Each structure stands twice: as C-alpha cells, then as structure tokens.
Amino acid sequence: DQVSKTSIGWLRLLHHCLTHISDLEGMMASAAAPTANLLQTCAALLMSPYCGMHSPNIEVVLVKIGLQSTRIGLKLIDILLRNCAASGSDPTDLNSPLLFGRLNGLSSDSTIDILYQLGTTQDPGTKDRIQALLKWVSDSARVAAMK
Amino acid sequence: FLSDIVRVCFFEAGRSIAHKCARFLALCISAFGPVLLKALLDNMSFLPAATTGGSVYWYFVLLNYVKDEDLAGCSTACASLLTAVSRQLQDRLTPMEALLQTRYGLYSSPFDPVLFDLEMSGSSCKNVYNSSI
Amino acid sequence: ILRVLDTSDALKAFHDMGGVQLICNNMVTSTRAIVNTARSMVSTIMKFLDSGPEGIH
Amino acid sequence: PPHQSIIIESGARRFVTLDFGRPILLTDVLIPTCGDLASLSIDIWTLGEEVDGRRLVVATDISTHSLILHDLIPPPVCRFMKITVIGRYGARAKIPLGFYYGHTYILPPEIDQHLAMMVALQEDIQCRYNLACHRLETLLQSIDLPPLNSANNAQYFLRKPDKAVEEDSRVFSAYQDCIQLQLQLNLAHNAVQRLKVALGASRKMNPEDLIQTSSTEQLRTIIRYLLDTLLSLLHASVPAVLQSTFHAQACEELFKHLCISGTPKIRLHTGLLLVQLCGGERWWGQFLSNVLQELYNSEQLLIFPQDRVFMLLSCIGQRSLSNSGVLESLLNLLDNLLSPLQPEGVLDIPMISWVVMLVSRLLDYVAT
Amino acid sequence: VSQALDARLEVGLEQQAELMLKMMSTLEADSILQALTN
Amino acid sequence: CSMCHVHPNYFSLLMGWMGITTESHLATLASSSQSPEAIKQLLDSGLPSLLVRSLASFCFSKMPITADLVAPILRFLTEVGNSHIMKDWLGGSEVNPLWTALLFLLCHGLTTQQRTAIENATVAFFLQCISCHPNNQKLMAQVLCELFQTNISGFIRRLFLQLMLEDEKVTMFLQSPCPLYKGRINATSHVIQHPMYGAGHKFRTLHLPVSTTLSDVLDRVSDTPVPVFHLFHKLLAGQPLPAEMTLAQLLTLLYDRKLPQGYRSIDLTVKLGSLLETCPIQSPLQVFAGMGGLALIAERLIPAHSLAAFGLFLRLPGYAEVLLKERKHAQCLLRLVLGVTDDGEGSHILQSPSANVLPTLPFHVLRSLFSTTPLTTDDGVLLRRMALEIGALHLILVCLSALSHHSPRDVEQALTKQRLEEEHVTCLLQVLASYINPVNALPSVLLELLSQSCLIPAMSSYLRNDSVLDMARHVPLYRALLELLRAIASCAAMVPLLLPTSVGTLLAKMKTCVDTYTNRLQKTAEIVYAATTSLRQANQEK
C-alpha cells in the first residue's frame, strides 16, 4: 500500500472534508488555516512523484484553503514563488519540520494553474495578491542588475 | 625550393596527385630529414586553407614518421595552431545543434552545405563516387 | 472512515470534536518522519553509467 | 547506396565471378573479416579469361586480418571480378562481398556533354537539400529538454513517456534523410568540379578572414589529426616549452571549447592529453573543482550531454588521483556546499548529488 | 596490416617503399593504442 | 506587451526610447507590438518606408543594409504579420514590388549560408502572407504567372513545392469551463504564446492541418470521448457544431459570417452537455489553377510511360479543374512528376495508401474530362485540335501496341503482370471510347490514324474467340469493349472502319449461341452484348 508507507492518507481525509459537501466547506477552511507549516507540507507533497493521489485534488485543496483569508493568500504566494522551506525550523531541534531538499521557484502545470486561480478570482484582497505578484516581478527584475 | 613543392603538392590539388607526391617523398627519404621537417613545419600554418580532406592523410603520416627528427619547435607551433583554431570553432555553434547532440546525441550538424571528408573502416573516400553494382 | 463521514451531521460533529485540527497536525508531523522511497537523480545517473553495484530475476 | 546478399546456394573449395555490366575504373577494394576461410585469391579480367586475365592480390590471413586495399595505382579498367575462396578444410557459411568504389565515366557521353547533364542534377539535389533542411527545422523547432533538477524530470528520463517516442523516431528519420541527401549533393558538386578542372579551368585560389571563412568540418578534422599527432609525440617521449604554454586560464578555456561540444572521439582524446600534460601540477585539482562548480551548477544555462562529460571527469580523476590534491579539493567543495545547515542561503541538492557520487567513485578506486 | 600487397613486381615497383609506408602506419597506430592504454 | 496593452502611451514611450521616433531591438519591438490598438500607432511612424525601401534597394544591388541584416528585418515583417489589419496592408499597392523583387534575388558576396537563410526567410514570409487570405492569393498567382511568362529548376521549384502542393495548417484556440488534461506531461516545458491565450488547464492552442475534423480536435484536446462536448462560436450562437464538419467548412461558415478574412486564430468554446452540406473553401492550388497556370507549368517542363502520359494530359485546357477534385491524388501525381519521391510530410508517395489508384489515375481523369467536355461549344473543337497537335492519340496507340503485343501493319509475377495489363487495356479502351463519343468534329487524321493502327487488329483478336465460359468471366473488359464498339457505331463518319472475320457476323454468332443457351437454361454482360448486337445490326445496314 501507499497509504501505509507515506503520509498521504491525511491529505485524502482533508480533501474529503473540504470538498464532499459544499455547504460546510467554508467552516472547515476556517479550522484548517491556523495550523503551522500546513501550506509548506501541502506544496511539498504537490511537487513529488505520484504517491497515491492525483495532482488535481491537491490543487483543489491548496486553492480552497488559500482563499479563505488574505494573509493566507500572501503566505501561499511566498511559498510558491520565493521560499518554500519550513518556518522557524532550526536543525538543532530534531523534531521540528525541515522541508529542505527542493529548489525554490520550480514551475509545473499545477503551479501555473494555482497561480492563475489565485490571480484572477474576484474577491476582497485580490488587490493585495496582484500587488505581491508585481512586487515579486519587480524584485526579480531588480536583482538582475547584479553587475 | 621544397617549401613551394609541398605547397603545390599537398595543397591546391587533388587526392591521387597528393598520393603520388607522398610516394615520391617516401622514395626520396633514403640530411634530408631535418630539411623536410622544416619545410612541413613552415607549411603547417597554411594547412587550414587546403582543398580536399583526403590530401592530408599521407601528409600527417609523413609528419608522424619524421617527428623523431625534432621535438621542440614542432610541438610549439602545433600547440600554437591548436590554440588559435580552438576558439574560432566554438563561435559557430547554434542552439539547434546543441539540442540535437544532447537530447538525441546526433553530431555532425546537418544544416551545413559543406562537407570535408568521408570514412569507411579506415579508408578515405573523396572526389570519387561509389560503384553501383 | 470515509464511509463514516458521508453525511452532513457526521461532518459537523467531527468538526465540533476538533478532528480537523487533529488530521492536519498528524499530516505535518508524519511528513517529518518519512523518507521518500521513490527513485531520483541518483538512479538516473547510475543508469547512464550503463552499470553499477514478474520482473524478478 | 547498395545493399547485397549472397543467395548462391562450406565444405567445398569455392569461387565467384561478378560482372559490372560495363568497364568500370575500380579504385578501392575492401573486404570484411572472413573467419571460415584459409585463403583468398583475386582475379581481374574484362573480356577474356586468358586474353587479359590478371591477378591483383592473394592473402591467407583474411580470417585474422580483414583485407583493406585503399587504392590501386595505376587504376586498371575492369568488368569481370573473380574471387576464389579456399576455406579451412578441417554447415553453410555466409561471406560478405566487401565494398568496391570507382569511377564510371572516362575522359581523355564521350564529349563534354556531362557539364550539361551534371549541373542539372547538382541543382536538383541542392533543391532537395534545401527542402530537407526546412523540413528538419520545422519538425525539430517544437521540442524541449527538461533540466535534471527534480524527481519529476528524473522519472521522466528513467521511463520515457509514450508521446516522446514517436517524436524521437520522426526526428531520427528526418535527420538521416537530410544527411544522406547532403552527402549526395556534396558528391554531385565534387563531380562537377572535377569535370570543370578536366577541361583546363583552374581550381580555386593573412590568417584573419582566412580562419573565419573556413569550413567547420575541415576545422574538426584538422584539429582531430593535429591533437592525435600531439598525443603520439607525447607518448613517444618530456616537453617543457609545451608545459610553459599550458597553464591556468589556458587549460580551462581549451577544455570548455573542445570537450563540452565536440565529438566523443575528440572529447576523449583531449581529456587524455590534458591528464597526461598537467597531471602533476599544483593548480591541478582546483581546476577540476572549478569546472565541476561551473558546468554542473544550478545556475548554468548552457546545454550539453552532462553524462558524457561526467564520465570523462571520472576517468581523468582516476588517472590523476596520484597527486592527492584532487581529492582534497573535492572534499573542500563538498564541505562548502553543506554549510547552510550547520549554523540566507539554501541547499543545492542536485549539485550535492553530483559531487557526492563523484567522490564515491574516486574513493572506490583508491580503495585498491 | 593483413600483409596483402597488390601485384606490383610486373611493373616498375614502388613496393620497397610502399611496405615502409605500411610499417610506419602500423607503428603509428600501435603507438596511439599504447598511448590510450598509457 | 501586456503592459503596453494596458497603457497605450507606454508604447509611444517605448518607441521614443528605441530612437525610431539590432536583432534584440527588432525582436523586442516585434513582440511588444501586438496590441490591437498599438499596432496602428506603430505603423504610422517608421514601419513601412524604411524597411521596404531598404529591401528594394538591396534587391536592385535609405539606411545602409548588409547581407547579414537582410534576414532579421524580413523575419520582423514575418513576426508582426499576425493581425488582420497588418495582413491586409501587406497586400497593398506599395508592397506589391517587394515580392517580385525577392524573386529577382532568388532566381539568379551572397555566401551559401547567407543565401540559404535569405531563401528560408522568404519562404516563411510568403507562406505566412498567403496563409488564409484569399485576397492575397490573386496577387501571388499574378506574380507567379508574370514571372513564368516574361525546365524549371532552382528556388522557384522549391517555392512551388512548399507554398503549393501541400495542405495548410491553422491555429485553433479552445477554452472550456472544465480542465483539459490530455496532451500534457509532468516534466517542465517552457511554452510561450501571446497573453491573449491565457495559461492553465482551461485553455489550449492547436496548430493543426485544415483537413482534420471536429472529432479529431476533441480527441486531441480531451480524453473523455447524454454527456458530450459541444463546440460553440459567438457568431454561430446557440448552434451546436456537428462533429462531422471539417475545418474547411468551419472557415467557409465563419468567412460568410462577416468574420475578417485572414484573422489569426479561430475561437471555440468547449461546453459540456443543415450544416453538413456546407461547401469547403478553395485551396491555394485551386485559386492558382483557376486562371490556368498549370498548363504553363506543363509546357515549361517509376513507369516512364504513365508519367509521360500524365504530363502530356496536363497540357490540355480544362484538365486542372477535373484533376483537382481530389487534392491528395492530384498533389501526389504533381510531386511525382516534378521529380520528388516523397511529399516531405513523413511518407513516401510509393508508400501512400492510394498507391493502387495512381498508375491508372491519369487515364480515368482524362476520360472524365472527355465525358464532361461537350463538343458543341468551341471548347470541344479546340481541345480536339490541341490533342491532335500534341499527339496524345499517338501515345495512346503506342502504349496499346506495347501492352497488347499487336504491332501495327516468375509465374505469380506473370499472373500479376497480365492482370494489371488487362486493367490497363480496359482503361485505355474506355478512354478511347469516351474520346470518340463524348456522351467538323472529325479530324482529317482520324479515320486514317485508326486504320493500320492497333485498334482494329486488337478488337479482332479480342472478339475472335467466341466460347461461352472461357471468356465469360471478363465482364468489365467486355463491357468496356462493347461500349467502345457502341461509341464507334455512334459516329457515322467513321463507321466504314467496320464495313469491308466479320465483326457483325461472328458477334451475332455468339449472340445466337448465348440466346440458345438461355433458352435451354453475368446477366449484365449478356444484356450489354444483346444491346451491342442490336446497335451493330442497326448501323450495319446504314
């Protein structure tokens, strides 16, 4: 089994909780966002070889959680673009999460779809998301003037 | 005037004539060694502007045999020419050739009209077509 | 477990008991204690070297 | 191009006779190794078995050494080719009938009408060459190459997806068609040039604007022959002026120019020459470290066959392991790459993988 | 290699130096091979 | 480009920065100038004059131009020629000399690589300009014909093989409210297009030949195929598009729906849930042959006899209209007679699926032309005069002599040869029958060329045998022979070829034999024989 060998069963449970009944969906989102390092873990599970669940479900979960607020959206943008490692992670603890081992800013069709969903959804806070995207573009252009 | 002899024999000529000239030089081998080595060293700078690729095999065989005469100047000039040529070749690369030789590993860029040589199990075949039997 | 949570009342009760935080915490902790056993760059490069140190042989 | 097989009928002494159907000026004879044989004899005759019957060459070690006859001078006109094969007397066997090359049209039809019926063929094959070039461009300009910096790309390379195989096959077919037809066009141009010279027209008559106007394939061939001569000269030996010429900022550029984008033969030979010349230098080893840090860096945009150059680096390091500086430099590089986790940079995992596997290979070799 | 020389005794022969050419070619090939083996 | 699309004045700032009001500058200007409203502002300052004057001056052998710089600017014109507004201007008056100028450069310090790059760029430019713009087709055909008038080899043949003689590809932009997963890979792949096409799983762009159908598009975009997929268009609002419709019919419908011609892409909406007879649009080869340029090509120019027959038949006026009914077969025959083994799309003409129809196709299309060309009008008499002048009948008679082994006054391989020779003889007899009877028309050489030829001896040899079962199996061959005899009887002026073993006597002999067999105890063959017997009896006394 892949469920017994990996940590993907919990993700399937979360996807079922979020998407089974659309009426309660918002409630579930409000209970999930405040957990620490959840977005980083989901993103890490997204960019790995197929281990038991397909990419579209992970994309759906990430989009649904990342749109229930505005701080969460900015955190997700930072995760996808500029830094995807764990938050407050010192290797001196041996118990805190440590999501090293993956390069920053890797592009795949799933990432492009998530970014497009985040950018072009009409809701409060969309202006802040566009501001963050343009700020990243400006920073990338500026850092190119390294000589 | 051995310098001009080599210039008109191994360059600006065909394949059979070059083979015959190499034959004549080999016959004339048996004081001549160092003189012919100097002549070939002087003519090496003019080598890149030759005409046929099959006209250099016997020439390089002769240089390989007579390299025992001297090892200092020949190596220096040879290294200088290698350094000079090396840079120029790199500038002619195009993305398509690199992509072809990386993704599929197919060299000998097929978008250049000009070729220079052919080979078959150690035989040089140029300026002559294949016999259709 | 999925069959148990097939109804709205069951999901609401599960949320009230705080299970939704439980599963997220479990996912975050369990990802830390597992190494991916799939193949990666190293296997590819070993294949490129053409050799190295029901499908069975 | 031809393609032949023997459907004639090996316990009996045998002979075969072939007719070209026309007196053909043969100028190249090649045969492959014939293991099931003891002797081979050659007979050449145009019209009669005794009026003009001649023999070219007889050899008995064809099974040990394949007979290669590059050229015949003077070239004898022939039409009937007899090969007598004497197998070892001590089931049926197949013996390939080698390869033969020569010229068909003889000049002192007979008139210089060829200049009218070669130029048209040259133009036609040139048009086909342009067609093949455009076809290859329009087919192969719509392909990509994933970089090897993730598990997804690694698994893509391990097991090719179904969609890529057909594209590979089509590109391969187009490439082989284009190269064959390029060869045909070059041969036609060469024949036209020969005929133009025959009538009495002369052939074509500073290094700058001479180096940059030459042909690329000529450059590759001359570099190959030149460097092979250098390697043979070094093997026959200890140069010192040659050592003075080669130093820092001179070996690196040479390696980058030739080994990265050359043919496998020139790559291997250049690597061997470099290891033979600068094997025991002090700056050696740090050169390998810098090359590895540059080419395989995650910030490199150049495209090249990483696996082949990796094997070349491994082979060079195995020979150069004596000076003890190469392994020290590699260990220093590995130490530097792992700094971030010790105490805002991050970890370059692919680079670490490359360097650690190289070090593992070297340590395995030094273990004996 | 293969010690197979075309019939040249009948005509004014260069074979006495063609054989030398063959030996020099074989010597260069062997030297290159031993360089590769080092 | 998106930034400039939002703010029009930013494009003016860009142009001022450029200095207009190298390769990198030119490519950046080409890419950034794709907005529907910034393009007109680009065209109004420095776009046409400099480039067109420079290229014209270079062709004649004004900013200075070198050999290397010629390709980048033409590539720029290629890249900017996407909007319909630009594509219309490319067919304008002032741009007309340009095309001809390029031909003057390519029909005669230009190195090999320079020449190859220039010719490739010119081919791409012409192909783009002629992509799906019917208005430019007339101009291009006129340019080609005036070049031809005032054998073919060199760049012109390459242009003919590329621009013509092949199908056309078009770009379709599909968008759906549901994700489309087919055709994608998990590996990284940098695919960059214009921002109007978007990114994600809800958009797709396909560059595919017009010969396909809607079912092919659905299979290529979605793996799912009453749950079905309906393709909608804004102009055809509310009308689901049947999957059997071809892309040619789509283009014709949109063009008659006042959609601007030559527009860059076709837009469709893939939603989840009277037009079948629409005429396809005309291919560029059809437009070129409409004015009669194929005859000029024929006069300007592997069974040798069949290729020679096809080439000779191509000379006849009106041949192109009948021949181009099947685009694939016509283009395959034209490429084969043009000295090219393969179409260049990845297949060999000898390996084409229609290889069994090619050898006899010229005879069938010539017979169709004969049947479809009445002799009442001057077209018929001019066709007869031209055919007699070019000696098509002479070649037909020579082929009949060679195949029937009637000189004028491996076992399995042998069986295949005799069967194909019988088929060829049947085709030739049908062609001759249609030539004699379409349904001063009699040439002077006629009634004389047929005599002493192989026609009468061949008919005598074929009809001499009069059994009831040995040759009763050759129903189509004898149907063709009796149709030819009926055509002979139809034209009175050439009847005396029959009147003085005897055709009528022994024909009535087998007719009586088969009538007796029927009375005592293949129906189409016997009824055709009876009808031919009646017609021969009627014409025998007259």
> Could A116 and F198 be called an inter-chain contact, meaning their C-beta atoms sit closer than 8 Å?
yes
Q: Give every strand in the sheet of F169-175, ordered side by side.
A: F203-209, F169-175, F266-272, F229-232
Radius of gyration of chain A (CA): 16
Experimental technique behind these coordinates? cryo-EM
Chain A residues whose beta carbon lies within 8 Å of the beta carbon of residue F184: 109
**Specified resolution (Å):** 3.3
Which tokens hold the place of D153? 């790309």
Output DSSP code: residue F213.
Answer: B
> Could B23 and E17 be called an inter-chain contact, meaning their C-beta atoms sit closer than 8 Å?
yes
Stated as kind and residue range, the H or E segment containing D20 is strand D14-30
> Could D155 and C38 be called an inter-chain contact, meaning their C-beta atoms sit closer than 8 Å?
yes
Chain C residues whose beta carbon lies within 8 Å of the beta carbon of residue D157: 44
Look at phi and psi of residue D251 and say left if phi exceeds 0, alpha if psi is from -120 to 50, else beta.
Answer: alpha
Give the mutation candidate from B17, B68, B102, B132 for the D interface (greatest D CB count, under 10 A): B102
Parallel/antiparallel/unpaired status of strands D77-86 and D39-45: antiparallel
Output DSSP code: residue B102.
Answer: I
Q: Residues F103, F107, F113, CA angle at the centre, nearest 5°?
A: 95
Angstrom CA distances, F46 to A12, F31, F54, stand at 60, 16, 12
Q: Which amino acid is at F182?
A: K
Angstrom CA distances, F427 to B128, C22, C55, D368, F324, stand at 46, 85, 60, 83, 20
Chain D residues whose beta carbon lies within 8 Å of the beta carbon of residue C49: 307, 311
Q: How far away is chain D from the Cα of C33, in angstroms, using its nearest Cα?
A: 18
The residues, any chain, with a CB within 8 Å of residue F331's CB and separated by 6 or more, are: F165, F166, F285, F343
Is the Cβ–Cβ distance between F529 and F511 less than 8 Å? Answer: yes
Chain F residues whose beta carbon lies within 8 Å of the beta carbon of residue D155: 186
Which tokens hold the place of D177? 């068609």
> Could D246 and B110 be called an inter-chain contact, meaning their C-beta atoms sit closer than 8 Å?
no
- Do F and E touch, 3+ Cβ pairs within 8 Å? The answer is no
Q: Which amino acid is at A102?
A: R
Parallel/antiparallel/unpaired status of strands D14-30 and D99-103: antiparallel
Alpha carbons F475 and B123: distance in angstroms, whole number: 63
Handedness of CA F74, F75, F76, F79 (dihedral sign): positive
Alpha carbons A73 and F64: distance in angstroms, whole number: 55
Burial class (CB in 10 A: 0-12, 13-18, 19+), A58: buried
> Residue D15's beta-bridge partner residues?
D84
Handedness of CA F369, F375, F379, F384 (dihedral sign): positive
Q: Does D244 touch chain A (CB under 8 A)?
A: no
* Interface residues of chain E, partner chain B, Cβ below 8 Å: 14, 17-18, 20-21, 24-25, 28
Helix axes D114-140, D162-198, angle to 10 degrees: 160
The residues, any chain, with a CB within 8 Å of residue F110's CB and separated by 6 or more, are: F67, F118
Chain F residues whose beta carbon lies within 8 Å of the beta carbon of residue D152: 186-188
Tell me the three-class secondary structure of F254-297, residue by residue: HHHCCCCCCCCCEEEEEEECCCCCCCCCCCHHHHHHHCCCHHHH
Chain C residues whose beta carbon lies within 8 Å of the beta carbon of residue D357: 42, 45
Q: How far away is chain A from the Cα of F221, in angstroms, using its nearest Cα?
A: 16
Alpha carbons A64 and A11: distance in angstroms, whole number: 13
Q: How far away is chain E from the Cα of D265, in angstroms, using its nearest Cα?
A: 12
Helix ranges (DSSP H) in F264-377: 284-290, 294-300, 304-313, 319-323, 327-337, 361-372
What residue in D sits closest to A103 (Cα-Cα)? D348
Closest CA to D16 of D79, D67, D83, D78: D83
Chain C residues whose beta carbon lies within 8 Å of the beta carbon of residue D353: 40-42, 45
Stated as kind and residue range, the H or E segment containing D28 is strand D14-30
Q: Under DSSP, is residue F99 helix (H, G, I), strand (E, B) or coil?
A: helix
What residue in D sits closest to B45 (Cα-Cα)? D207
The residues, any chain, with a CB within 8 Å of residue A107's CB and separated by 6 or more, are: F188
Which tokens hold the place of E21? 């050419």
> Residue D45's beta-bridge partner residues?
D80
Which tokens hold the place of D355? 């360097």
> Could D272 and E35 be called an inter-chain contact, meaning their C-beta atoms sit closer than 8 Å?
yes
Is the Cβ–Cβ distance between F12 and F41 less than 8 Å? Answer: yes
Q: Under DSSP, is residue C44 helix (H, G, I), strand (E, B) or coil?
A: helix
What residue in F sits closest to A109 (Cα-Cα)? F200
Q: Does F201 touch chain A (CB under 8 A)?
A: yes
Alpha carbons F427 and A144: distance in angstroms, whole number: 74
- State the chains in contact with C (3 or more Cβ–Cβ pairs under 8 Å): A, D
Closest CA to A84 of A113, A109, A62: A62
CA torsion, points D135, D136, D137, D138, in degrees to nearest 10?
A: 50
Is the Cβ–Cβ distance between F30 and F39 less than 8 Å? Answer: no
Q: Under DSSP, is residue F88 helix (H, G, I), strand (E, B) or coil?
A: helix
Which tokens hold the place of F132? 């799906």
Alpha carbons F337 and F309: distance in angstroms, whole number: 11
> Residue D69's beta-bridge partner residues?
D29
Which tokens hold the place of F164? 């013509």
Which tokens hold the place of F149? 């008038």
Closest CA to C46 of A108, F207, D356, D259: D356
Is the Cβ–Cβ distance between F378 and F385 less than 8 Å? Answer: no
The residues, any chain, with a CB within 8 Å of residue A11's CB and separated by 6 or more, are: A42, A45, A53, A58, A61, C27
Is the Cβ–Cβ distance between D188 and D119 less than 8 Å? Answer: no
Q: Under DSSP, is residue D15 helix (H, G, I), strand (E, B) or coil?
A: strand
Q: Is omega for the bond preceding F195 within 30 degrees of 0, making it cis?
A: no
What residue in D sits closest to E33 (Cα-Cα)? D232
Angstrom CA distances, B66 to B40, B43, B63, F366, stand at 10, 15, 5, 74
- Nearest-CB residue to D203 (from B12, B47, B133): B12
F288 phi, psi to nearest 5 deg: -65, -45
- State the chains in contact with D (3 or more Cβ–Cβ pairs under 8 Å): A, B, C, E, F
Alpha carbons A89 and F258: distance in angstroms, whole number: 63
Q: Does E32 touch chain D (CB under 8 A)?
A: yes
Give the mutation candidate from E21, E22, E23, E26 for the B interface (greatest B CB count, under 10 A): E21
> Could D155 and C39 be called an inter-chain contact, meaning their C-beta atoms sit closer than 8 Å?
yes
Number of helices followed by number of strands (H, E) in chain A: 7, 0
Q: DSSP strand E in D34-177: where?
A: 39-45, 54-59, 68-69, 77-86, 99-103
Q: How far away is chain A from the Cα of F216, in angstroms, using its nearest Cα?
A: 24
Q: How far away is chain C from the Cα of A19, in angstroms, using its nearest Cα?
A: 11
Which tokens hold the place of D324? 């003890």
> Residue D81's beta-bridge partner residues?
D18, D44
